[PDB]
Design a binder for this molecule. Structure first.
Ligand SMILES: Cc1cc2c3c(c1C)C(C)(C)CC=[N+]3c1c([nH]c(=O)[nH]c1=O)N2C[C@H](O)[C@H](O)[C@H](O)COP(=O)(O)O
Ligand SMILES: Cc1cc2c3c(c1C)C(C)(C)CC=[N+]3c1c([nH]c(=O)[nH]c1=O)N2C[C@H](O)[C@H](O)[C@H](O)COP(=O)(O)O
Ligand SMILES: [K+]
Ligand SMILES: [K+]
Ligand SMILES: [Mn+2]
Ligand SMILES: [Mn+2]
Ligand code: NA
Lengths: 503, 503
């Protein structure tokens, strides 16, 4: 077999999953109406191999197969974050701390802007359709959850928009559903960059004609950074090229001057209008609910051209209860930038993480106790400082509870996080509300309350640092096997386990 | 061999665990100093078979073996709460919901007070020691955690105290450690009945000579109800009799008038003094810590006699992180009595449970939404009503957060509980503090703060019921595989999973 580069090539990613027995190619006929979404949910929820649906009801031979669960978790024996590690070309047993640390290190690597390659060398240009051949209702788009407001074609593709001055090209994921044979509608919301750039076009009188492209099965490294809140004005493509160690190969669109990854599976191109809008949603989302008939108008994308590979594959994420891409990518990549913001702001933080079990609503910060002790501060002052740093920034938007814990907690292990949460904070008394800050509108306790109208508040910083830990060493014993007993005893016990009679 | 009655006979319980491959007889030499405790924590934390240590360093042929983890959890195939079910003589696969409901059904049965049996055939009277033969320091008492203040002999035996008027005889578990060759010390705290009854002796001038017995390896149903907060004035023995369907067989102590279970493994008898105290603790406890050198003066029990079976077994609980007897018994028996209290107080609660992952600090109340809606109430009023019922009485003593959820949550499954907790309450805004109620002194966020000195407040009711659920039907889709899709699709996917290629 060829040397695989799963960060760079979506098809190498799929092959490396097959080589690790972490991909099931499903060749019986599967219906895109619900059945694909249900198979995906069963696979996410038991951390099972990713389904590749090779035979969808209503598909043509090229349009399309579906790869579900591209950044779902899997069994610990093969690297439970191996699919995420493969998006970055890392070893599959890389830990989540190492994945986050690698993305931070890559911010100081030289950015490598995309390289234009010839069309004859771009698989995405194998088949090219002009406007009259666009028939979006022909595609076997999945209907992913009961009560969704449409069929969501765009759950794990990349939108490409560029500012009118051409200085900033943004790549990002935002959901999109098929409206009719020529149009898609989807979320284009503050504070996201896709709406900052669409607003720039509106500012020069072009709100109804914003060029875009939509790319599926892009280089896995590019879809991952599409989900990451890197700074405004920074083009994702150049940080993707630093992660890959090589410029992303790109080719020009048929109908506009945007550049798309040459190895994309499918590319749609057209114009977005902020003034022609359409009912969108609802859509089963990252906090685990579909709230019925709770759709709202969103901008319309008019598809004017398409190109695709032979035997094209649509990757799909089907959000809901933990754990799927809206936890493993959205939450971990907020945590990556929250670590970067701690570093920029000089907070004494070792690591940050958004536990999957808290549906990407909790951000845990592991605090360096000696650095905290150097501040000679109190919990009330520190909680305020921390909430003021995060809750009025775009990185903090999705977060509703920031939990502060000492450096003896492995924040990437929810068993330690829930222990430290329940045992180390006094309910209410150790929580600081932040009432003026922008609420995240998708949190269900916001959207199903009168807060949905004010859109402020409902966030807190919770102190799970004991008062003594703000001042000095505080040595207690953690009553479990691995931490509670001396290493020589732990090892003796583990060595004799079988001899005792354990089977 | 014999028909086995594990609720009535401690040795039948051990037998029924051996029959279910849930008990490992360790014949090699094990040191009661740490080694026992570490083996036990390994077993609890992976839900492994209980260890029976038949050869402790320092033991005599009779005093003693140790049975660890008598109500730990085990594999789901065997019934994961089967050890708890065998305490009550139920089928091993009975769920914890069914266990709780069975205990509530037993409240309606005829109580059956204990019956005296002949000494001549009571195994607990096989060996009898007079005062001068009592040498507690010669027993192979375990030293269970690093930095415990002593060796804890009493972690899973029953203290027996009776009121001076003889109307009420209480059976309960409270920790106790060896002080010297004749004395034990341990927790005797308000509001527990051991302290209530001791206080009644002090009120008549007998604070320093309160008779007691301490019994190990009692009928398993008796040790379970000893950990249950049944009402004051009710003698546990009479409810144990209702659960067993027969009176508990008892014999009188050598040195006082209390009655002990005839099939006890070991019995210690003597006098308790409230006003002669000794340093007791620290002890690794139910919330997962040993706080070093944080011992405190507790009463002293003087042992004056002791009786025991041939080849006696000491059952031992070694608390810490989830999950051990301090979560499976203390929490679930609080929940049992909390469900009883909701029935008596007219609250619309279907079930109550204290999740093990929350270290028996959280009580979840599953609220029947038709019943709530018939109250025509608001969250603020209902949370006040609920907190006032529970946190102002003994059954709420250990509980620091009561979480209200609707009847779509399976409160016995922490994956559903954590999802409802994070997505359905607004942090701080949907939490009602109770500042004036008694705090649980063992909660670490109480003990390691200045609340240790006031022992008030730090409790909360958290409302995780959506505002529309107080009013009317609110139908939303839960985005997981079993709840999110029509039953017929769930079943088809499960039927086809192997054929798809899932291995
Ligand atoms: C991984 C992922 C990220 C989604 C996402 C999904 C996935 C699978 C869906 C499609 C399955 C559910 C919907 N998502 C949306 C979303 N951001 C947003 O504005 N609208 C969304 O509809 N996000 C997050 C978004 O991609 C990030 O917030 C990026 O930081 C946005 O890029 P930007 O910083 O350049 O604006
Ligand atoms: C199962 C169990 C229950 C313990 C317990 C333990 C276990 C294994 C230990 C020994 C391992 C840790 C310590 N425990 C204590 C305890 N209650 C108490 O007052 N002091 C304690 O030291 N409890 C709980 C106590 O038994 C219950 O609250 C009973 O309701 C008290 O009975 P009562 O209602 O008759 O007062
Ligand atoms: K992005
Ligand atoms: K009791
Ligand atoms: Mn961006
Ligand atoms: Mn009692
Ligand atoms: Na083809």
């Amino acid at each position: 077999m060829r040397k695989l580069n799963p960060a760079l090539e979506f098809r190498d990613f799929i092959q490396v999953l097959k080589d690790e027995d972490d991909l099931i190619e499903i060749t019986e006929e599967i219906d895109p109406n619900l059945e694909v979404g249900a198979i995906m949910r069963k696979a996410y929820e038991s951390h099972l191999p990713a389904p590749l649906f090779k035979n969808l009801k209503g598909a043509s031979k090229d349009l399309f197969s579906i790869l579900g669960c591209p950044a779902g978790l899997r069994s610990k024996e093969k690297g439970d974050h191996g699919r995420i590690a493969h998006h970055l070309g890392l070893d599959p047993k890389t830990t989540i701390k190492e994945i986050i640390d690698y993305l931070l290190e890559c911010k100081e690597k030289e950015p490598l802007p995309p390289i234009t390659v010839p069309v004859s060398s771009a698989p995405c240009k194998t088949h090219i359709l002009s406007e009259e051949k666009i028939h979006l209702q022909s595609l076997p788009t999945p209907y992913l959850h009961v009560s969704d407001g449409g069929k969501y074609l765009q759950t794990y593709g990349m939108w490409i928009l560029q500012t009118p001055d051409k200085k900033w090209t943004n790549w990002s994921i935002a959901r999109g559903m098929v409206v009719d044979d020529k149009h898609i509608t989807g979320l284009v919301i503050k504070p996201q960059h896709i709406r900052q750039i669409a607003d720039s076009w509106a500012a020069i009188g072009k709100a109804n004609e914003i060029p875009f492209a939509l790319c599926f099965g892009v280089p896995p490294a590019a879809i991952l950074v599409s989900s990451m809140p890197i700074p405004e004005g920074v083009s994702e493509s150049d940080y993707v090229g630093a992660i890959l160690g090589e410029s992303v190969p790109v080719v020009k669109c048929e109908t506009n001057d945007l550049m798309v990854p040459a190895t994309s599976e499918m590319v749609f191109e057209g114009t977005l209008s902020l003034t022609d809008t359409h009912l969108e949603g609802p859509f089963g989302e990252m906090h685990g609910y579909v709230f019925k008939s709770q759709g709202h108008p969103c901008p319309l994308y008019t598809v004017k051209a398409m190109s695709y590979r032979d035997n094209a594959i649509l990757p799909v994420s089907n959000p809901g209860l933990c754990t799927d891409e809206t936890h493993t990518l959205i939450g971990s990549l907020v945590a990556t930038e929250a670590k970067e913001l701690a570093i920029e702001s000089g907070l004494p933080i070792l690591d940050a993480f958004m536990p999957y079990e808290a549906q990407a609503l909790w951000l845990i910060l592991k605090v360096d106790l000696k650095g905290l002790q150097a501040l000679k501060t109190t919990p009330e002052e520190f909680c305020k400082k921390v909430g003021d740093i995060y809750f009025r920034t775009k990185v903090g938007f999705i977060v509703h509870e920031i939990i502060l814990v000492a450096d003896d907690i492995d924040i990437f292990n929810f068993k330690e996080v829930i222990w430290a949460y329940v045992t180390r904070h006094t309910p209410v008394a150790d929580q600081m509300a932040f009432d003026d800050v922008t609420s995240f509108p998708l949190a269900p306790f916001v959207s199903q309350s009168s807060r949905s109208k004010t859109m402020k508040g409902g966030k807190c910083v919770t102190n799970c640092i004991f008062r003594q830990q703000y001042e000095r060493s505080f040595d207690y014993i953690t009553c479990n096997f691995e931490k509670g007993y001396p290493k020589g005893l732990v090892d003796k016990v583990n060595e004799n386990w079988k001899r005792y009679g354990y089977k």
